[PDB]
Amino acid sequence: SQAWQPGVAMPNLYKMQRMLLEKCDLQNYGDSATLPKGIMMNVAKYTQLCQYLNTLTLAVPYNMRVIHFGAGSDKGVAPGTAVLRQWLPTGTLLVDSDLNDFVSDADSTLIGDCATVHTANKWDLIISDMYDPKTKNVTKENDSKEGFFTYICGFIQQKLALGGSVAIKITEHSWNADLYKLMGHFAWWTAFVTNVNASSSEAFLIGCNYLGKPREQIDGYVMHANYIFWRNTNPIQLSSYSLFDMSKFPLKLRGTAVMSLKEGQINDMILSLLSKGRLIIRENNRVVISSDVLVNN
């Protein structure tokens, strides 16, 4: 049974299929997990995401840099950011961002469209929970979405350190073909479904160990159809069981090496170290970030 796991990762065989897209129809739709007393759904969801990320080869350098997009909520607080700061080593730098103002435990918070966020530095881990509420207000033909996903694709290709990882929230309707294509630029990737929210088409697209080039050519439209086929045919039982054992929750501080190598020095030995979560390639300059202010009368 997968009920005692934090969630379920899409089996590799689905990535090699060529499914036609169709509606995501979940058998366990409407169901609900038993949330521990006073625990918010997003604390439970991020806790299970972090419980699963613990099982991967994440690079965890000293002075690790983490950026969290879509960290705000209609509550005005940042539940996911509070979980990431609990999970990450105490010395890690955590910056979060959202379209709407919110109160956060992050080292720095940027308010505005993610398209307005600028940074001269590379990051070791990108977490995104961005989701447009208009995605359910009006249902449209399920094409690749090009709002904040275009920014995320650009941010991955320009501001993610080699060896870095990402967890980007998608749903049946909130997805992007270019983002699936970019999953082929990591040593490994998957679509992870938290057990507490298994009644939703939501998943986190996890790219583990960025290689800065494609190890596999992925057709994003076909890969999203493959993801839906998995969700439609292998029901996931709602479960909060993994939330009750927090003894091995903290991300282990591996102290992964950080080197500033040029693009012409990336050989097969380096790609091999990046692929094992044993190396981060980026400069270590002062972390500087900002959000544009649109000025008008």
Partner: protein, 122 residues
Amino acid sequence: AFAVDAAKAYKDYLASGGQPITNCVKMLCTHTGTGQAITVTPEANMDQESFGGASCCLYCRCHIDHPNPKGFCDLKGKYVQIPTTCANDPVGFTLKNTVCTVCGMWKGYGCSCDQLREPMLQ
């Protein structure tokens, strides 16, 4: 000389029957922690709940300046342990209570610095 006294205003609001500030972020933890008041990671014991600090700070939540020259917050970016009997109003608890500068426990809720001398134990 005028200065808004948010702390006093929240206490008077509570005394009048006002609904405590909600959506303080409670964390999942083992409840086998040190029990210290404000920590870098959740440290709740069996008689406490751990919350994200920023969500339990009146000044952070009301978008008001912190009552000190530097405007520094002692809760933001940390975890505050609240006794379970007071977990319904973490903002009110942090305002009405003081952390012991010696043991790091809440005064009257963990600090044993003022208890009679214990006989020595082998």
